[PDB]
Design goal:
The chain is an alpha+beta fold. The protein contains one helix and two strands; from the N terminus they run αββ. The PDB classes it as de novo protein.
């Protein structure tokens, strides 16, 4: 479940990892 971290590194814009949802506030 580190894809959350990967996204947070990529995007810092707030990536909301809510279960299977990744809401990117950018």
């Amino acid at each position: 479940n580190d894809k959350c971290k990967e996204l947070k590194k990529r995007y810092a814009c707030e990536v909301r990892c809510d279960x299977p949802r990744y809401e990117v506030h950018c």
